[PDB]
Structures are given as structure tokens and as C-alpha cells.
Amino acid sequence: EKGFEAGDNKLGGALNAKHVEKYGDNFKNGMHKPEFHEDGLHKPMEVGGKKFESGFHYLLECHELGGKNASGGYGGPLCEDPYGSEVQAMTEKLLKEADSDRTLCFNNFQDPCPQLTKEQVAMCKGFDYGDKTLKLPCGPLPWPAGLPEPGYVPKTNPLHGRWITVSGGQAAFIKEAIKSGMLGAAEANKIVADTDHHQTGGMYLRINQFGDVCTVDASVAKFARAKRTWKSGHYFYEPLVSGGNLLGVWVLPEEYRKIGFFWEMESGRCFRIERRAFPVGPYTFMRQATEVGGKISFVFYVKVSNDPESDPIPLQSRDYTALAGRDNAPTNLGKPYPTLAKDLDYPKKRD
């Protein structure tokens, strides 16, 4: 109910209405829309009776929503102890190996990255991102040079399952900020912006994958929408709990790696990103690497189950809005990217 996953398990499982009944009206129609003190997350707030020392404290509690197995734990049949010392050591080694890895997407992010102008960002301020019938005010978003074209269809659905974050989780960064006692507005604002969206991870991911189409359950502590479905090469909209708005795309050009990008509309920045799955010892890990302005942020997850224990939702896209109705819009080097500016779920009107 409430647009969330069907189920009443109070101990765990995919996010459902019973899990968030306690947060007054913050959760509705599958969306998480909380109200943080006008000033910033450093200032306190109150949700359905419970007062929170700060907005960060609310986010910390929201991080615990939706990623647990049926009995309230985080482990699964493929890895019963994701937070154990064994997994930690493998993760530390992968982290160190990540700095020397020269196989990253976009030619290790050296490909020329597009950026929206000051005017373009200004035009979009206040735009109704939920209206599928509107063209983005700044015209077609630039596709990032070096993005592979779509067409490949994964054969083994390797992303399908439940993944638990073992490095780069946002809660760890929030706990650091909280320990910093007295935070100022500027300070809180920077923490939110620096760890926003894919710069850090939620505590889990549940993925339903069928070839080049996936449904992904992500942390509502970070993303306003609990569940999203997208298709390789097609746009989708990510409203953020921070108030930010992203229009991005995932391409699945290979069997074990996704390559994509997300336009953060309020800053005009194009974050480029990849997710790859690979084995280490008896486990399967996923490394997420997000880059902007020369800075690469890594998130690591360990696969705890082949079952996401969450259902897919209908397919959609936001190619019309994002490309402002322009078929085969270009990359920033003037090369046409083969995606038509029509939403896969047309004529649905709202997103």
C-alpha cells in the first residue's frame, strides 16, 4: 500500500507501508518527501511526533529502511556476514586497487565532460520535472562524449539480487558529521552536496534485471523514489531527498558493467558513472565509481542474494523531457546518440 512494495513484514524485506507508517506523511505514493528545517540539516526537525536532534539524525534512521532480509538481518545465502572481518579485508584491498585501475569508463573519465552554462541552469530553476509533456527549458541535454551506444542485451542478468554496501555508504559520512557536534549551515550544506546521490551509497540495492531492463530499489534516505525502472540508453528522472533533481541514463553495453551519467540540474554538472560486478574469493562484488571535476568517488557492495525479494514496476523513460523532443540529440563533440526523444511509457502524463 501507499505506492510501496506489497507486504507487511515489520522486521525487514523490501520497503513497505508498514515500515514507514511511523513517519507521518513523509512517505506517500512511493515517494519520500520530508521537510527539513528551513535553515539546513544541521537544525532539528520533527516527524509525526518524534523530534530529531537534526535532519542528519533523521537521514541516519532512514538509512536503516528497506535493505534487510526477512528476519531483520542484512546477510543473505550468498554472504551471511557482509559486515564481517573477512569481507572488510577484501574490501580494503579492492579500494586500494581502485586507485590504480585504468579500465574505468569514459577512458578513465578523461573523455571531455559536458557542462551546462549558468543561463541553462537558471532557465530550469523551478521547472516541473514531474510533467512528462514538457521539454526541458535549456533544450536537449548533451550526451557525454565517450558514452557507449545501446544495443547489447546482458544474457545472465548478473545484477539481479540484493547487494549490501560495504564501503562508501552515506551513513558513515553522516555519523562523522554528527560527531562533529555543532554544525553550521554552510557546513551541513556542503555535507549534503558532497555526499548527494551517487557520490555515496545507500546501505543496499535490490535489482530486478531482465536483459537491458532493470527495476532498482535504492535508499529512500537519499532518493525520493524508492523504486525506479529504466532501460539501457533511456533517460529517467531521479528526484532527491536533498531537493536536487537528476536526469540520467544507464547503458548496459557489456555483460558485467553498466556505464551512465546523471545531470544534476541545479549545478549544471554531468556526473559520469559505472557499476561493475566481479568475483573475489567465494563472493561477487559490485564496484560503483562516480566522477565529476576530476574527483572519483567509489561505493562497494557485496552480493548477499540472487533474489531481490522485490517486484519490478512498469517501464518508463523521460527521453522526451530530457532531450526536449529532439531525436538522436548529440554528445558534446557533436556526435548523434541513437535514442529517440519519446517516452517508453507515452502517453502517461506524470512522473
Side-chain angles (χ1 to χ4, degrees), residues 162-174 176-178 181:
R162 186 163 62 84
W163 303 79
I164 291 301
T165 306
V166 291
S167 177
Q170 185 189 43
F173 287 91
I174 296 179
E176 273 291 350
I178 291 189

Side-chain angles (χ1 to χ4, degrees), residues 188-202:
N189 286 178
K190 182 177 204 289
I191 292 167
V192 170
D194 286 353
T195 62
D196 212 3
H197 53 86
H198 299 308
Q199 280 165 129
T200 56

